[PDB]
Amino acid sequence: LDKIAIDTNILLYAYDNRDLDKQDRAVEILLKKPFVTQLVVFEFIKVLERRFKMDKKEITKLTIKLLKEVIIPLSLHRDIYNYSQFLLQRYNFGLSDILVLSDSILNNCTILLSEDMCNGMIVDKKLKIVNPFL
């Protein structure tokens, strides 16, 4: 009835097990086959290679498995840059966050399951940011 997208922190909490409860929440969210934008995937890959020091081959295998089974990747939209420019007029987020929001909105996503994005307010009256850990 309404599309759902996720942010990189959801995948990071699903993988990392320092806080078990948030990991369980993230796994539960992933169980519903949520859509995802390629920017989130690239950020996830960068974080895994940098923060968790996993080698290239296992990271690529994990990404391929996740995209094949768990989550649905979203095709990159050609209007991401113009819309990101438009969104910057009213909203003051990070540029990467703005790009994530623009690609989510351009693909008719209505919920963006994120944490570090000041959950609660609607975005352009098309999408809303929800923190699932609260």
Binding site: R78, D79, N82, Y83, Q85, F86, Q89
Partner: protein, 1212 residues
């Protein structure tokens, strides 16, 4: 020595420029460049601006705005009625349940279509007023016609019923809302005319026409006699249309002073003239002596089939509705105690005017009748004040420091021409300007009969008592005669003579019962203020009564005299009242001449000029003119110019010459140019684009260097007034400041004329150049026509010249079928030295020796004029074949708009009404969204509908234009069959079958064509069409309206190419463009759903290049080596539909022959433009075209290394 010449040819919508650097002394010159700027108007505007009929975009914009404003006013009235009725609790429960009263007060709730007389429950609709319906059933039964009636006829019956019986509160609500919905014609001004205002519409039959013996132009005229005893004032010539015929006129009877009616006659036509229909309905209601609603009822009683709205009573005076509605409210006010309550009347007033204490307190003294009539339903706003557009005084200035930390000047508004000060000033001017002449010796007899101040004082005092001086009065004032003297002016013309004072004196004598001392200057000014300030009838009455009350005068006949005072004419003087008050003491002479009333500045200046000392504001011109002002008393009988210089210190209007040091001044002036500052928009836009192109050329070819231009020449070719204005504007560039070039216009600006242009074109070979340049279209026309008539050989030049057959020579013109004749004319005007135009305008010399020098220097012996240099023809032809035309585009889809609305804002603890800007962003669509005609979606089983299309149908009137197939294109199959039967009976002749009389014959004998079954009469039929029409909107019933794309809104045409190379084309609807631009995206999607990258979008008046078939252009770039062929392969988008895009060769302006349906021959076939190249190759342009962008000057712009450097040098 070396001269720079800028020739400009300004057409109706085209601007041809030519800049040339030449050396006349050595016969050496080269052409710097030329170009043409085309402002795209369709041929309709070109054919219309000669006469003018709503020829403006702003006119239609204002029309739409006014319609919307009326609609919004009606909606606001309905909202207020809903609020009042709810707070009084008169509406039915279900009706009140569906209306908001908390946030959107009085508005229907979202997705609701409530009705007052219909209640919904479990999907069933039931009528609400059963007893009234039964009562109307009993009426009809008494009438005895039928028992079958719609439930919604009860409104008229109950409107009549409320006159003498009690009805429910819901009844009152329904009647009030219906009255709101239908207000009626009205005039705000009032100003009641003659007591009669007969204007009676009657139909009279002529009995006999007795010959009146008026033999004019070999024909004797008759008179007209009617049965009542009236005669037509005008004569009658043709007796065929006047004998024993019933002629109807609207007649007005006026009681003349002699004591008999002066009846007027004016031809009127029934159901064709708005005034005639209005008067007929007026009289029909009047002689019935009943309310208009009652008249409609009675008509329904007589004939149930009679339609009411738009046919029976369309237009009547608002006073009729006012009378009926009052009568019903005063009748019902007795029965309903609520209409006499006061708590509810205070509550509703507070609801309507919560933030207005004043209006609340005022209205707390009225009754509900006043609220329903004069405050809600019949309230009409007064005209908006027009004083904001009044011109400013050119003499009086005020200097003040604003909030912006500066000190700037506010001007003084112009004095009204009806001001007694202005009237006195004009009268003094005329009296002083008077000089007399005699008839015997025609000598200047003035200064003899008018020498001393006493005579001028007597003339002024005599002219005060009159309203308009003329020949007889002026001659009699001096005891002179008509046969012996005149007054130097028109012997049969009259001039204003301060009529306001005389009229006031006449009225103040008509009131009587007072002394002859009430009227004075203060009283005259106060009377002028009272009448002119209060421009409202009832408030004027109140002001007159108050004026009569304050002064100790009887208010018995003064009010009657002053109530019919004519409103003052709308006219304002050049100066203001301050200037006239300052100047008037100086002009007057005698006892009216006084030194005390003069201000400090003028008195000090007079003292200085009589002293003879030196002031920095005194020139030798002053002492030359004012040498006769030796004493301060000599300032008697002064004139406007001398007194003006004495008061202010400037001699008349000498302008400021003006010099523009660079393009900065020109661009500042362009930015500060005010819109709608000319006669018509076409001229102002032409001038603005001329200024733009001259700015661009100066910036490019001057490179920021002042005085680069030396001479500018202007050619025009209705449009005559623009010459002086453009000369004045362009004088500010090449003006010479040393004093050798002074005046209103610079001597450098040399206007041209057609004579010199055609003479030089024929003599200098330019006509031959044009003919050979335009030939290729002509031999192509010959080839397609399969005839040789379009090119004719000549032996005097030994070549083929263009020609046209006579049937196509109606509006044919060789020079007008290519956009480059403007540049050619600019070039010929530029090289046309002032000697050429002076010689051709001064051919009459009276001596051969005076002009033989010019004959030798400019004309090659009187045979042919010399060329400016050796290579004139070659350079001209090469540049004409190597030029590209630049088109101005209008692609405004959406734009930002600002809304300022009145609201009671809370500040400093108090409420104040003030302007508030609308919150958020509100875009304004700059194009018509769709066509006006609305179609509804229908489905028919007997028509196969392909996917991607829908069936839509709309009503059409029945007429002879219906053939067999058209009948086959009707939604109602039974109607199709009946029409087929009737047409068969009419032998398949649509003209005779579907005549209005034939339509009535069908309607009355509809049984004979429906196999004896009953059917209703036919007037309109819904015709269908299988197409693709989109929806108007998405809320309410806007989803049920289907419309077609408006004219000239297919702005964007997208061309994509997939990975392997195939090109795809789409057309973006205006709705998608609007949404994309609102979201901040670009107009055309970057990527079609097919998965192809967007190559480019195309807009009307865009330029594309079609490469040769052999060559492959992928990254050619290099758009500076534009030779003949490359430029000749440049096309322009003209229109677009679906995946079809139409192009025209960019140099083609008018087709040699347009397409016709009979012969089916045209230069560019049926569409007047081809989807492919015009030449023999016939290759689809869109498959290989490449988009090209150009500046104003027609220069191709392509990426360079420097551009790539700068594109992000700017972000650093």
């Amino acid at each position: 020595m070396i001269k720079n010449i800028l020739g400009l040819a300004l057409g109706t919508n085209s601007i041809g420029w030519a800049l040339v650097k030449q050396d006349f002394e050595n016969k050496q010159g080269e052409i710097l460049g030329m170009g043409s700027r085309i402002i795209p108007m369709s041929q309709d505007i070109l054919g219309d601006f000669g006469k003018g009929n709503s020829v403006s975009q702003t006119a239609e914009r204002t029309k739409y705005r006014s319609v919307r404003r009326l609609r919004e006013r009606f909606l606001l009235r309905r909202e207020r009625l809903h609020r009042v009725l709810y707070i009084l609790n008169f509406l039915p429960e279900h009706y009140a349940s569906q209306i908001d009263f908390e946030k959107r007060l009085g508005k229907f709730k979202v997705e609701t279509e409530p009705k007052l007389v219909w209640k919904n429950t479990d999907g069933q609709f039931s009528f609400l007023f059963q007893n009234s319906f039964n009562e109307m059933l009993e009426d009809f039964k008494a009438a005895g016609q039928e028992l079958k009636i719609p439930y919604d006829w009860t409104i008229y019956h109950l409107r009549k019923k409320a006159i003498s019986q009690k009805i429910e509160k819901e009844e009152l609500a329904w009647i009030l809302l219906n009255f709101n919905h239908k207000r009626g014609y009205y005039q705000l001004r009032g100003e009641d005319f003659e007591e009669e205002k007969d204007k009676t519409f009657v139909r009279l039959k002529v009995d006999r026409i007795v010959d009146s013996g008026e033999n004019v132009k070999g024909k004797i005229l008759y008179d007209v006699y009617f049965e009542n005893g009236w005669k037509y004032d005008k004569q009658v010539v043709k007796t065929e249309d006047w004998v024993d015929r019933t002629k109807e006129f609207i007649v007005s009877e006026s009681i003349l002073k002699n004591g008999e009616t002066k009846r007027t006659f004016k031809a009127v036509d029934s159901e064709k003239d708005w005034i005639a229909i209005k008067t007929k309905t007026e009289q029909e209601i009047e002689h019935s002596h009943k309310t208009v609603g009652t008249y409609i009822y009675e008509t329904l009683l007589q004939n149930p089939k009679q339609k009411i709205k738009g046919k029976l009573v369309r237009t009547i005076e608002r006073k009729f509705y006012k009378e009926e509605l009052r009568q019903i409210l005063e009748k019902q006010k007795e029965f309903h105690q609520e209409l006499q309550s006061d708590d509810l009347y205070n509550d509703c007033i507070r609801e309507l005017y919560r933030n207005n204490e004043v209006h609340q307190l005022t209205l707390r003294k009225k009754d509900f009748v006043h609220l329903f009539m004069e405050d809600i339903i019949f309230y009409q706003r007064p005209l908006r004040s027009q004083k904001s557009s009044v011109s400013n005084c050119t003499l009086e200035f005020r200097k003040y420091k604003g909030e912006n930390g500066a000190e700037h000047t506010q001007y003084l508004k112009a004095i009204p021409k009806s001001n007694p000060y202005y009237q006195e000033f004009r009268l003094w001017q005329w009296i002083f300007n008077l000089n007399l002449y005699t008839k015997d010796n025609d000598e200047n007899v003035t200064k003899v009969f008018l020498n001393t101040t006493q005579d001028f004082e007597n003339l002024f005092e005599f002219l005060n008592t009159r309203k308009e001086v003329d020949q007889k009065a002026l001659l009699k004032h001096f005891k002179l005669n008509e046969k012996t003297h005149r007054w130097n002016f028109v012997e049969d013309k009259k001039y204003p003579c301060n009529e306001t004072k005389t009229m006031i004196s006449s009225r103040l004598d008509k009131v009587e019962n007072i002394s002859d001392d009430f009227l004075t200057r203060d009283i005259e000014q106060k009377i002028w203020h009272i009448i002119y300030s209060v421009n409202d009838k009832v408030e004027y009455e109140k002001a007159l009564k108050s004026f009569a009350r304050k002064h100790h005068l009887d208010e018995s006949s003064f009010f009657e005299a002053f109530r019919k005072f004519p409103p003052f004419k709308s006219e304002y003087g050049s100066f203001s009242e301050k200037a006239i008050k300052k100047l008037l003491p100086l002009m007057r002479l005698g006892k009216y001449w006084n030194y005390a009333e003069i201000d400090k500045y003028s008195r000090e200046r007079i003292q200085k000029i009589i002293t003879g000392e030196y002031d920095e504001n005194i020139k030798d011109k002053v002492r030359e003119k004012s040498v006769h002002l030796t004493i301060e008393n000599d300032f008697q009988g002064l004139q406007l110019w001398l007194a003006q210089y004495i008061v202010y210190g400037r001699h008349s209007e000498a302008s400021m010459i003006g010099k523009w040091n660079s393009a900065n001044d020109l661009e500042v002036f362009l930015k500060d140019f005010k819109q709608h500052s000319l006669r018509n928009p076409i001229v102002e836009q032409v001038i603005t684009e001329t200024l733009r192109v001259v700015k661009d050329i100066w910036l490019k070819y001057g490179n920021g260097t002042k005085d680069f231009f030396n001479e500018i020449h202007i050619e025009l070719g209705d449009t005559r007034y623009i010459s002086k204005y453009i000369s004045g504007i362009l004088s500010n560039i090449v003006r010479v400041e040393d004093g050798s070039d002074e005046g209103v216009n610079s001597k450098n600006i040399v206007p041209g004329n057609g004579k010199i242009t055609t003479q030089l074109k024929q003599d200098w070979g330019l006509n031959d150049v044009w003919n050979d340049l335009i030939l290729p279209r002509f031999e192509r026309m010959n080839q397609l026509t399969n005839s040789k008539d379009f090119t004719a050989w000549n032996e005097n030049h030994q070549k083929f010249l263009p020609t046209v057959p006579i049937e196509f020579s109606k509006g044919f013109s060789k020079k007008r079928i290519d956009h480059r004749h403007h540049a050619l004319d600019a070039l010929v005007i530029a090289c046309a030295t002032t000697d050429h135009v002076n010689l051709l305008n001064n051919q009459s010399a009276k001596s051969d020796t005076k002009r033989y020098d010019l004959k030798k220097k400019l004309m090659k012996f009187p045979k042919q004029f010399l060329k400016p240099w050796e290579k004139f023809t070659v350079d001209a032809k090469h540049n004409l074949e190597s030029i590209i035309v630049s088109f101005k585009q209008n692609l405004r889809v959406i734009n930002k708009a600002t809304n300022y609305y009145e609201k009671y804002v809370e500040k400093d603890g108090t409420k104040n009404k003030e302007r508030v800007e609308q919150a958020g962003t509100n875009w304004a669509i700059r194009k018509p969204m769709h066509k006006d005609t609305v179609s509804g979606k229908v489905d028919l089983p007997w028509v196969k509908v392909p996917k991607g299309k829908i069936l839509t149908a709309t009503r059409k009137s029945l007429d002879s234009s219906f053939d067999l197939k058209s009948i086959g294109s009707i939604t109602d199959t039974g109607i199709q069959k009946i029409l087929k039967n009737y047409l068969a009976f009419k032998d398949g002749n649509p003209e005779l079958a579907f005549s209005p009389e034939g339509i009535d014959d069908l309607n009355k004998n509809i049984e004979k064509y429906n196999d004896g079954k009953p059917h209703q009469p036919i007037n309109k039929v819904r015709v269908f069409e299988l197409g693709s029409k989109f929806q108007v909107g998405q809320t309410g019933n806007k989803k049920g309206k289907y419309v077609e794309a408006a004219k000239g809104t297919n702005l964007f045409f997208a061309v994509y190419e997939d990975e392997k190379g195939k090109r795809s084309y789409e057309t973006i609807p205006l709705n998608e463009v609007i949404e994309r631009q609102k979201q901040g995206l670009t107009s055309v999607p970057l990527e079609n759903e097919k998965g192809s990258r967007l190559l480019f979008d195309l807009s009307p008046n865009d330029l594309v290049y079609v490469p040769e078939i052999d060559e492959n252009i992928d990254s050619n770039f290099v758009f500076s080596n534009l030779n003949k062929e490359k430029i000749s392969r440049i096309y322009k988008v003209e229109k677009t539909s679906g995946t079809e895009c139409y192009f025209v060769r960019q140099d083609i302006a008018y087709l040699i022959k347009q397409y016709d349906a009979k012969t089916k021959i045209g230069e560019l076939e049926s569409q007047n433009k081809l989807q492919v190249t015009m030449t023999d190759d016939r290759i689809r342009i869109t498959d290989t075209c490449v988009k090209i962008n150009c500046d104003r000057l027609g220069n191709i712009n392509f990426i360079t290394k420097e551009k790539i450097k700068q594109i992000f040098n700017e972000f650093r």
